[PDB]
Design a protein around this ligand. Structure first.
Ligand SMILES: *[C@@H]1O[C@H](CO[C@@H]2O[C@@H](C)[C@@H](O)[C@@H](O)[C@@H]2O)[C@@H](O[C@@H]2O[C@H](CO)[C@@H](O[C@H]3O[C@H](CO)[C@@H](O)[C@H](O)[C@@H]3O)[C@H](O)[C@H]2NC(C)=O)[C@H](O)[C@H]1NC(C)=O
Ligand SMILES: *[C@@H]1O[C@H](CO)[C@@H](O[C@@H]2O[C@H](CO)[C@@H](O[C@H]3O[C@H](CO)[C@@H](O)[C@H](O)[C@@H]3O)[C@H](O)[C@H]2NC(C)=O)[C@H](O)[C@H]1NC(C)=O
Ligand SMILES: *[C@@H]1O[C@H](CO)[C@@H](O[C@@H]2O[C@H](CO)[C@@H](O)[C@H](O)[C@H]2NC(C)=O)[C@H](O)[C@H]1NC(C)=O
Ligand SMILES: *[C@@H]1O[C@H](CO)[C@@H](O[C@H]2O[C@H](CO)[C@@H](O)[C@H](O)[C@@H]2O)[C@H](O)[C@H]1NC(C)=O
Ligand SMILES: *[C@@H]1O[C@H](CO)[C@@H](O)[C@H](O)[C@H]1NC(C)=O
Ligand SMILES: *[C@@H]1O[C@H](CO)[C@@H](O)[C@H](O)[C@H]1NC(C)=O
Length: 257
């Protein structure tokens, strides 16, 4: 079960640039007997590192690898360009929570100022002096085609790249076993409704008060509903790690008695 890594991380590169593809398996091998594939066709390279000294149009395509131990790696698309500006991306398809590095790369490392970053045609970031954009933690709003524009001898634009940010679980919805306003003494079940679209830790809250902390149970019961229980209720759904947690819209419960 191999995996491809790039020395300069960028999946999109200019013509005449250096990019090295390394086939590495954590189940350790094996070593060197390597099997590199370009557009579903095996290449003459056996070295664990597929080095491209000066990139050209035919070096573009889908890459796959095999290292000693059986298990063909996930396919990675590498694209070589010509032009003035290039929006460089570290990955094309990834799950939310994973960081995303963006780079507005200029031809022959020329100096560019008044740099803009676009997501689906709309500019979202300005940099006076060219700088990299690293989104520490991604979500579904980061999905889409990215571009960059900057000022050199003239205002140049880069070609666009589609980035796919895959959603794990949708933002949760707090559902109550009874409708609001409810009568005092009622037994209420609070359920943090979400579906993993493929371990989840849930927590229940009331305004600022913590009702129940991190646990696998998607349910919480208000044993005997009192007037003091009237307020805004919301839940939080998160991965074991914690990396990713989503809050739910506030659900008001009015208790009458
Ligand atoms: C954006 O990031 C580029 C890549 O950096 C790596 O990835 C980032 C996401 C981040 O994790 C960072 O910490 C990593 O190192 C940066 O490019 C690096 O810096 C140079 C610019 O291309 C380059 O080098 C040069 O500098 C010497 C002088 O010291 C010159 O002689 C030479 O010609 C180069 O100009 C180096 O190859 C590169 N490093 C890697 C690992 O790719 C860069 O800071 C930044 N780019 C911009 C445009 O702001
Ligand atoms: C692996 O598949 C790649 C993608 O299909 C292929 O690259 C593509 O190749 C052609 C020709 O080299 C390019 O298409 C045409 O448009 C350009 C405009 O820049 C002109 O130079 C020519 O008219 C040209 O025929 C594609 O742009 C190019 N890249 C992509 C990303 O589609 C590779 O050649 C294949 N590599 C191997 C080793 O089989
Ligand atoms: C970002 O949003 C969606 C994912 O939430 C992207 O993909 C959609 O679904 C499939 C699978 O990737 C593709 O066939 C389509 O491109 C998208 N749906 C439709 C109905 O077209 C999507 O590519 C991203 N960006 C945009 C601008 O749609
Ligand atoms: C996707 O995550 C980003 C953060 O990575 C959220 O952006 C917040 O930060 C912006 C500017 O950086 C600030 O103006 C607002 O607070 C943004 O909301 C973004 O909201 C988020 N979207 C979803 C749907 O989760
Ligand atoms: C790239 O591939 C195309 C189509 O197979 C061919 O016409 C062309 O000569 C190749 N160019 C280089 C630089 O190898
Ligand atoms: C809670 O969700 C279940 C399943 O979708 C549904 O039967 C029920 O009506 C929901 N509760 C309310 C108060 O709508």
């Amino acid at each position: 079960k191999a995996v491809i890594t790039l020395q300069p991380p960028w999946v999109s590169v200019f013509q005449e640039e250096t990019v090295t593809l390394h086939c590495e398996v954590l189940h350790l091998p094996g070593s060197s007997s390597t099997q590199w594939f370009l557009n579903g066709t095996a290449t003459q390279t056996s070295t664990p590192s597929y080095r491209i000294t000066s990139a050209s149009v035919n070096d573009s395509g889908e890459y796959r690898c095999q290292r000693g131990l059986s298990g063909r790696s996930d396919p990675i698309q590498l694209e070589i360009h010509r032009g003035w500006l290039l929006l460089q991306v570290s990955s094309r398809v990834f799950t939310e929570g994973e960081p995303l590095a963006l780079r507005c790369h200029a031809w022959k490392d020329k100096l560019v100022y008044n740099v803009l970053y676009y997501r689906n045609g709309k500019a979202f970031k300005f940099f006076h002096w060219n700088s990299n954009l690293t989104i520490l933690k991604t979500n579904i709003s980061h999905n889409g085609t990215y571009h960059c524009s900057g000022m050199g001898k003239h205002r140049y634009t880069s070609a666009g790249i589609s980035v796919t940010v895959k959603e794990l679980f949708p933002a949760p919805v707090l559902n109550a076993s009874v409708t609001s306003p409810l009568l005092e003494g009622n037994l209420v079940t609070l359920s943090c409704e979400t579906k993993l679209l493929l371990q989840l830790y849930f927590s229940f809250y009331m305004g600022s008060k913590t009702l129940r902390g991190r646990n696998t149970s998607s349910e919480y019961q208000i044993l005997t509903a009192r007037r003091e229980d009237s307020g805004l209720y919301w839940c939080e759904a998160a991965t074991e790690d914690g990396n990713v947690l989503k809050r739910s819209p506030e659900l008001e419960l009015q208790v009458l008695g």
